[PDB]
Structure 1
C-alpha cells in the first residue's frame, strides 16, 4: 500500500508515458491540446494539457517524446516514449556499461541509453528551463515507459541540482547502471525518482545483475495482474537497493506484464 495521493500521481504519469505512443503529435504544432487514441490517457485529456514541444528519433539514440504544460495540475512534463517494437528491442539489448562520472563519482551506466540522451540533452534542457521560467511555481516532471523509462531517469539524474527540483516517474524501466549509480539515484537530492515495476515484468530485470547492474531504491511494485485495474492497495514500496520480493524475483518473467502499467501502455489500440 501507498498513499492515495501517490497512487493518483503514479496513474497520471503512467498515462503521460502512454501518450508518448498514442497521442497524435509526431509533428503536431506546439500549442495543441494533448489527446490519445484508444482511451490511453483520459486523466491527461481532462486537464488543460497542451504540447509545448514535440520531438522524434532525435539525434544518435533515435529518441521520441514531447514536452507538455499542464495548467490544471501545474506541471511541466517531459515524456520519453519507448521502442516501437519492444520485443525486438529486448532481443537486441546489449549489457555494455560505459563509465559516466560527469554525472557521478565512479558511476557505471548502460552504454546504449546514456549515449542516446547525452546526444540530445542540450537542445532539450534549454526547453525545460524555458517553461520553468515561464511558470516558476510549476513542478517539473519527467516520465517514461520501458526505454523511455530508462531515459527520463538518466535525463533526470543528469539535470537536477540546477535550480528546480525534477521528479521522475519511470514505468517498467530497465537497469541503467552499476551499484554506484544505483546509489546516486537512491539518495540524490533536487527531486525524487519513482521507479515503478509491474509484477514479473521482464524489463525491470534486465540487464542482469550478473553483468554488474543494480537497481536504485526504492521500487514501487504493482502486484495486480496484467489487464487488472490498479488500486492504491496493490502497490508495495520496496526498500533497499536490489531488494528481492518485488519485481526482482528468481521466477520466470513475462512480456505482457510490461505493457500493463495502470492501464494499456507501450502499445495503442
Structure 2
C-alpha cells in the first residue's frame, strides 16, 4: 500500500469547491419519506445556494441494507449534471454492517454496465458496495443517460456521503470506463475494494500508480473528502481492503473548518490524515461522520 505523511494546503477557491459538493451530498438526505425536494430545487438552506438548478428525479429504495436513495439534477449555472447518492438505511445500521460483517469480495465486472473487459482481473470490491452501485444504476441509470443526451456538453458530477460515497465512487468508475469524463467527490467514504481495485482506480483517474495528488486542478476528477475522527473512511479494514489515492482531509473538529485546516493528502494511507485518527478522536462515531463543512445526514440544516 502506498503510504505517506505528505500533505499540502489549499486555496479558498478549492475550499469553496469542496463545500459545494458537501452541500449537494447533504441535499441527498432531503430524499425519502417524511422529506422532499420541491421543484425546481427547494429544500431550505442548502438548496438555496443553487440558483438555476432543476431537480430531474428522486429515487429511493429501502429493501436491502445496502440500497440507496438520492437525486438527479441539472445546474444550468455551472453547466453540470449532478447525481447524488446516499444510503437509504440509517447511518447507524449501515455503518454497523460495514464495520462488523465480512463481505466476500466480488469482481466489479459483475456489476451493471461493466463489460467483462473494462476492469483488471484482480478488481475485487465489497459485495455490499456493489449492491449500492447496482441499486443506483437500476433506479436512475436510464434517466441519467437521457439527461446526458439532453445536455451533452454539461460536465457530469457524482457525489455522496457515507454509503452514498461508496456508490458514487463505483458509479463514477462505471461512467468513466463507459466513455464519459465524470467528476467524483465522495465524503466520509468507506474503503471499497482491494489493492488490485485501488491501484487500478488510481491508474484510471490519475494515470499511474502512486500518483501525485497534492493539488486541486481543473483536470483532476477524483477527490475523497475525510474528516478527523471519522472512522467510516477507515473501514472495513479486513486486511486486503485499501483505499485508492485522492484523500482531502478536514483536520478540524467541527463543521465550517478554517481554510488552513483542509489539506490534500498523498498516498493511499496517510497518518497525517484519516489513518492517523487517534482513539479519543474516534470515540463519537456518528457525530464525527456528519461533520463535512456542513452537517451531513439531516435534511434542512
- TM class by shorter chain equals 0.7 to 0.9
Q: Does structure 2 conserve the Cα–Cα contact (< 8 Å) formed by 1:24 and 1:36?
A: no
Equivalent runs, 1:89-108 vs 2, <5 Å: 89-93=94-98, 94-102=101-109, 104-105=119-120, 106-108=122-124
Normalising by structure 1, we get a TM-score of 0.88
Matched, 1:212 2:231: no
Corresponding residue number in structure 2 for 1:63: 68
Q: Provide the TM-score with structure 2 as the length reference.
A: 0.79
What is the CA–CA distance in structure 1 between the aligned matches of 2:75 and 2:92, rounded to whole Å? 32
Given the alignment of the two structures, is residue 13 of structure 1 paired with residue 21 of structure 2, yes or no? yes
Gaps in structure 1 of 5+ consecutive residues: none
Distance apart, 1:235 and its partner CA: 1.1
Residue in 2 aligned with 1:52? Answer: 56
Q: Which has the higher contact order (CA 8 A, sep 6+)?
A: 2
Q: Which one has a larger percent helix, Structure 1 or Structure 2? A: 2
Of residues 43, 47, 55 in structure 1, which corresponds to 2:49?
43
- Aligned residue for 2:54, secondary structure, equals strand
Question: In 1, distance between residues paired with 2:26 and 2:147?
Answer: 22
SS of corresponding position for 1:188 = helix
Q: Structure 1 residues 244 and 95, CA, compared in 2 at 3 Å: closer, same or farther?
A: farther
How far the C-alpha of 1:5 sits from its partner, in A, is 2.7
Q: Distance in 1 between matches of 2:92 and 2:199?
A: 29
Check if 1:239 corresponds to 2:266. Answer: yes
Instruction: Describe the shift of the 1:110–1:124 C-alpha distance in structure 2 as closer, same or farther (beyond 3 A).
Output: same
How many residue pairs were aligned?
Answer: 263
1-structure distance, mates of 2:252, 2:35: 36
- Secondary structure of the corresponding residue to residue 69 of structure 1: strand
Which secondary structure does the structure 1 equivalent of 2:267 belong to?
Answer: coil
Deviation (angstroms), 1:126: 2.6
2:148 to 132, 137, 143: 132
Q: Distance in 2 between matches of 1:78 and 1:43?
A: 17
Following TM superposition, the consecutive aligned residue runs of length 4 or more in structure 1 with deviations greater than 3 angstroms are 23-29, 58-61
1:26·1:54 contact (CA, 8 Å) conserved in 2?
Answer: no
List per-residue Cα deviations over 1:11-49 (Å, max 9, x = no partner): 1111110001136898969x9212224x344423xx211
Q: Alpha-carbon deviation of 1:168?
A: 0.6
Assess, with a 3 A threshold, how the Cα gap between structure 1 residues 147 and 101 changes in structure 2: closer, same or farther: closer
1:122 Cα deviation after fit: 4.8
SS in 2 for 1:81: strand
Q: Check conservation: 1:161, 1:189, Cα contact below 8 A.
A: no
CA–CA distance in structure 1, aligned partners of residues 277 and 71 of structure 2 = 36
Q: Equivalent residue of 2:147, what SS?
A: helix
